[PDB]
Protein backbone atom coordinates (compact mmCIF):
# COMPACT_ATOMS: atom_id res chain seq x y z
CA UNK A 1 0.00 0.00 0.00
CA UNK A 2 1.03 4.07 -0.73
CA UNK A 3 2.96 4.97 2.97
CA UNK A 4 3.30 8.64 4.51
CA UNK A 5 5.88 8.39 7.10
CA UNK A 6 5.78 11.35 10.04
CA UNK A 7 9.18 12.12 11.53
CA UNK A 8 8.97 12.22 15.26
CA UNK A 9 13.14 12.76 15.49
CA UNK A 10 12.68 15.92 14.31
CA UNK A 11 9.32 17.10 14.30
CA UNK A 12 7.87 20.71 13.28
CA UNK A 13 4.28 22.25 12.98
CA UNK A 14 4.69 22.53 8.81
CA UNK A 15 5.34 18.93 8.75
CA UNK A 16 2.48 17.83 10.69
CA UNK A 17 0.28 19.89 8.25
CA UNK A 18 1.51 18.28 5.34
CA UNK A 19 1.44 14.85 6.97
CA UNK A 20 -2.18 15.66 7.18
CA UNK A 21 -2.73 16.79 3.66
CA UNK A 22 -1.30 14.00 1.91
CA UNK A 23 -3.74 12.06 3.50
CA UNK A 24 -6.89 14.07 2.52
CA UNK A 25 -5.63 14.10 -0.99
CA UNK A 26 -4.65 11.03 -1.40
CA UNK A 27 -8.16 9.55 0.04
CA UNK A 28 -10.63 12.29 -2.18
CA UNK A 29 -12.53 12.47 -5.34
CA UNK A 30 -11.85 16.31 -6.20
CA UNK A 31 -14.95 15.97 -8.51
CA UNK A 32 -17.28 15.65 -5.42
CA UNK A 33 -18.45 19.40 -4.29
CA UNK A 34 -21.29 19.06 -1.10
CA UNK A 35 -23.24 21.92 -0.38
CA UNK A 36 -21.09 24.33 -2.90
CA UNK A 37 -18.33 24.17 -0.19
CA UNK A 38 -14.49 23.60 -1.22
CA UNK A 39 -13.78 20.99 1.38
CA UNK A 40 -12.60 17.78 0.61
CA UNK A 41 -14.74 14.77 0.25
CA UNK A 42 -13.61 10.91 0.45
CA UNK A 43 -14.52 9.39 -3.17
CA UNK A 44 -16.19 5.86 -3.58
CA UNK A 45 -14.94 2.25 -2.24
CA UNK A 46 -12.54 1.12 -4.39
CA UNK A 47 -11.20 -2.58 -4.70
CA UNK A 48 -8.19 -2.01 -5.96
CA UNK A 49 -6.35 0.02 -3.32
CA UNK A 50 -8.16 -0.32 0.03
CA UNK A 51 -5.23 0.73 2.54
CA UNK A 52 -3.25 3.18 3.38
CA UNK A 53 0.12 3.11 5.57
CA UNK A 54 1.36 5.62 8.38
CA UNK A 55 4.63 5.56 9.46
CA UNK A 56 5.97 7.27 12.98
CA UNK A 57 9.39 7.36 12.77
CA UNK A 58 11.48 7.74 16.09
CA UNK A 59 14.90 7.70 16.71
CA UNK A 60 14.57 4.29 18.82
CA UNK A 61 12.15 2.49 15.87
CA UNK A 62 9.55 2.77 14.14
CA UNK A 63 5.43 2.08 14.60
CA UNK A 64 2.69 1.70 11.97
CA UNK A 65 -0.79 2.59 11.34
CA UNK A 66 -3.05 1.08 8.76
CA UNK A 67 -6.72 2.65 7.70
CA UNK A 68 -9.29 1.77 5.53
CA UNK A 69 -9.41 4.70 2.75
CA UNK A 70 -13.00 4.27 2.16
CA UNK A 71 -14.01 6.01 5.38
CA UNK A 72 -10.16 6.19 7.63
CA UNK A 73 -11.50 3.28 9.90
CA UNK A 74 -8.84 1.56 12.14
CA UNK A 75 -7.30 -1.77 10.48
CA UNK A 76 -4.42 -2.73 12.21
CA UNK A 77 -0.88 -1.87 13.84
CA UNK A 78 2.74 -2.61 13.46
CA UNK A 79 5.50 -2.67 16.44
CA UNK A 80 8.60 -4.82 17.44
CA UNK A 81 8.87 -7.37 20.32
CA UNK A 82 10.86 -6.98 23.33
CA UNK A 83 12.93 -9.37 21.00
CA UNK A 84 13.05 -6.38 17.97
CA UNK A 85 11.01 -8.91 16.18
CA UNK A 86 8.52 -7.42 14.16
CA UNK A 87 4.73 -7.86 15.01
CA UNK A 88 1.17 -7.22 13.34
CA UNK A 89 -1.92 -6.56 15.90
CA UNK A 90 -5.25 -6.57 13.39
CA UNK A 91 -8.93 -6.43 13.48
CA UNK A 92 -10.38 -9.69 11.61
CA UNK A 93 -13.56 -7.38 10.41
CA UNK A 94 -11.53 -5.35 8.56
CA UNK A 95 -8.26 -6.98 6.42
CA UNK A 96 -7.54 -10.41 5.81
CA UNK A 97 -3.65 -12.22 6.17
CA UNK A 98 -3.22 -11.93 2.00
CA UNK A 99 -3.96 -7.97 2.64
CA UNK A 100 -2.03 -7.60 6.00
CA UNK A 101 1.02 -9.33 4.20
CA UNK A 102 0.98 -6.39 1.74
CA UNK A 103 0.18 -3.84 3.92
CA UNK A 104 3.10 -4.81 6.16
CA UNK A 105 5.12 -6.96 4.33
CA UNK A 106 7.84 -6.99 6.89
CA UNK A 107 5.57 -9.55 9.53
CA UNK A 108 5.56 -13.35 9.05
CA UNK A 109 2.25 -14.29 8.96
CA UNK A 110 2.92 -16.70 11.74
CA UNK A 111 3.22 -12.92 14.08
CA UNK A 112 -0.06 -11.66 12.77
CA UNK A 113 -2.22 -11.88 15.51
CA UNK A 114 -6.09 -10.60 16.11
CA UNK A 115 -7.28 -8.51 18.74
CA UNK A 116 -9.44 -9.65 21.14
CA UNK A 117 -11.44 -6.40 21.38
CA UNK A 118 -13.91 -4.26 18.87
CA UNK A 119 -12.47 -0.96 17.59
CA UNK A 120 -15.13 1.23 18.65
CA UNK A 121 -13.86 3.97 21.49
CA UNK A 122 -16.34 2.45 23.87
CA UNK A 123 -14.53 -0.92 23.85
CA UNK A 124 -10.84 0.50 23.50
CA UNK A 125 -11.19 2.92 26.28
CA UNK A 126 -12.63 0.25 28.70
CA UNK A 127 -9.02 -1.77 28.26
CA UNK A 128 -7.13 1.40 28.94
CA UNK A 129 -7.95 1.36 32.32
CA UNK A 130 -8.39 5.15 32.92
CA UNK A 131 -9.15 6.08 36.71
CA UNK A 132 -10.20 9.86 36.77
CA UNK A 133 -12.54 11.96 35.40
CA UNK A 134 -15.18 10.23 33.17
CA UNK A 135 -12.46 7.61 32.25
CA UNK A 136 -13.28 8.31 28.70
CA UNK A 137 -10.38 8.82 25.48
CA UNK A 138 -11.00 12.66 26.88
CA UNK A 139 -8.97 12.29 30.47
CA UNK A 140 -5.52 11.50 28.34
CA UNK A 141 -5.04 14.83 26.34
CA UNK A 142 -3.80 15.45 23.18
CA UNK A 143 -0.57 16.53 21.01
CA UNK A 144 2.95 15.75 19.76
CA UNK A 145 5.07 15.07 22.66
CA UNK A 146 1.95 12.98 24.05
CA UNK A 147 2.07 10.90 20.80
CA UNK A 148 5.61 10.39 21.52
CA UNK A 149 5.21 8.79 25.10
CA UNK A 150 2.54 6.41 23.98
CA UNK A 151 4.61 4.78 21.47
CA UNK A 152 7.41 4.21 24.17
CA UNK A 153 4.39 1.92 25.50
CA UNK A 154 4.94 -0.62 22.28
CA UNK A 155 7.82 -0.05 20.71
CA UNK A 156 10.21 -2.82 21.29
CA UNK A 157 8.40 -4.27 24.22
CA UNK A 158 6.16 -7.20 25.69
CA UNK A 159 2.84 -6.48 24.60
CA UNK A 160 0.53 -5.05 27.73
CA UNK A 161 -3.43 -4.16 26.95
CA UNK A 162 -3.69 -1.25 29.18
CA UNK A 163 -0.51 0.15 27.20
CA UNK A 164 -1.89 -0.85 23.27
CA UNK A 165 -5.48 0.86 24.25
CA UNK A 166 -3.31 4.22 25.31
CA UNK A 167 -1.73 4.18 22.32
CA UNK A 168 -4.55 3.39 19.88
CA UNK A 169 -6.75 6.18 21.49
CA UNK A 170 -3.65 8.88 20.62
CA UNK A 171 -2.85 7.60 16.70
CA UNK A 172 -6.36 7.68 15.81
CA UNK A 173 -7.22 10.74 17.12
CA UNK A 174 -4.03 12.78 16.00
CA UNK A 175 -4.12 11.78 12.16
CA UNK A 176 -7.70 10.18 11.34
CA UNK A 177 -9.80 12.72 13.24
CA UNK A 178 -7.50 15.62 12.72
CA UNK A 179 -7.62 15.10 9.06
CA UNK A 180 -11.51 15.35 9.07
CA UNK A 181 -11.69 18.16 11.58
CA UNK A 182 -9.53 21.24 11.17
CA UNK A 183 -10.48 22.71 14.67
CA UNK A 184 -8.56 19.78 16.10
CA UNK A 185 -5.20 20.20 13.53
CA UNK A 186 -5.28 23.73 15.24
CA UNK A 187 -5.12 22.99 18.68
CA UNK A 188 -1.90 20.57 18.04
CA UNK A 189 -0.35 22.86 15.90
CA UNK A 190 -1.20 26.22 18.04
CA UNK A 191 0.79 24.39 21.25
CA UNK A 192 3.38 22.51 19.36
CA UNK A 193 4.83 20.28 20.22
CA UNK A 194 3.35 20.30 23.57
CA UNK A 195 0.73 17.59 25.73
CA UNK A 196 -2.38 19.64 26.72
CA UNK A 197 -6.11 19.37 27.66
CA UNK A 198 -8.52 18.37 25.37
CA UNK A 199 -12.09 19.11 25.21
CA UNK A 200 -15.81 18.77 25.12
CA UNK A 201 -16.46 20.36 21.92
CA UNK A 202 -13.62 17.77 20.51
CA UNK A 203 -15.46 14.73 21.48
CA UNK A 204 -18.75 16.41 19.88
CA UNK A 205 -17.28 16.99 16.55
CA UNK A 206 -16.01 13.34 16.66
CA UNK A 207 -19.57 11.93 17.74
CA UNK A 208 -20.92 14.01 15.01
CA UNK A 209 -19.09 13.53 11.38
CA UNK A 210 -22.01 11.64 9.72
CA UNK A 211 -24.86 14.13 10.79
CA UNK A 212 -22.32 17.35 9.98
CA UNK A 213 -21.41 15.22 6.30
CA UNK A 214 -25.49 14.74 5.71
CA UNK A 215 -26.02 18.32 6.64
CA UNK A 216 -23.51 19.83 4.32
CA UNK A 217 -24.41 17.24 1.28
CA UNK A 218 -28.59 17.25 1.37
CA UNK A 219 -29.40 20.75 3.08
CA UNK A 220 -26.79 23.15 2.39
CA UNK A 221 -26.54 26.00 -0.68
CA UNK A 222 -23.53 27.92 -1.27
CA UNK A 223 -21.97 27.07 2.13
CA UNK A 224 -25.17 28.43 3.90
CA UNK A 225 -27.37 25.76 5.77
CA UNK A 226 -31.27 26.22 5.25
CA UNK A 227 -31.88 26.29 9.25
CA UNK A 228 -30.17 26.57 12.07
CA UNK A 229 -28.14 23.46 13.20
CA UNK A 230 -26.30 22.29 16.77
CA UNK A 231 -24.15 19.51 17.10
CA UNK A 232 -23.56 20.25 20.92
CA UNK A 233 -21.52 23.30 21.02
CA UNK A 234 -23.53 26.05 19.82
CA UNK A 235 -25.87 26.94 16.85
CA UNK A 236 -24.40 27.47 13.24
CA UNK A 237 -25.78 29.10 10.01
CA UNK A 238 -22.40 28.90 7.96
CA UNK A 239 -20.65 25.78 6.63
CA UNK A 240 -17.63 27.66 7.29
CA UNK A 241 -17.73 27.92 11.17
CA UNK A 242 -17.31 24.35 11.42
CA UNK A 243 -13.92 24.25 10.13
CA UNK A 244 -13.91 20.93 8.26
CA UNK A 245 -11.04 18.73 6.66
CA UNK A 246 -12.67 15.74 5.29
CA UNK A 247 -16.36 15.09 4.50
CA UNK A 248 -17.64 11.24 4.52
CA UNK A 249 -18.78 9.52 1.15
CA UNK A 250 -22.72 9.78 0.67
CA UNK A 251 -22.64 9.38 -2.89
CA UNK A 252 -23.21 12.35 -5.78
CA UNK A 253 -25.01 15.27 -5.53
CA UNK A 254 -28.79 15.78 -7.20
CA UNK A 255 -29.13 18.00 -9.78
Known amino acids: ATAYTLNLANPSASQYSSFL ?111 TGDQSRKELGLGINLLITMIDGVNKKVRVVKDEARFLLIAIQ ?36 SKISTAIFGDCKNGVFNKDYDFGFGKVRQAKDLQMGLLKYLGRPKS
Not at 184 to 190: A, M, P, S
Not at 202 to 208: D, E, L, N, T
Request: net charge positive; aromatic share 12%.
Open 21 to 131: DQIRNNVRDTSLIYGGTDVAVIGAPSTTDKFLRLNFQGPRGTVSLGLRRENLYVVAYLAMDNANVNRAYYFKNQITSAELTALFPEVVVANQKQLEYGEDYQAIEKNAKIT
Open 174 to 209: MTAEAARFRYIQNLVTKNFPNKFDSENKVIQFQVSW
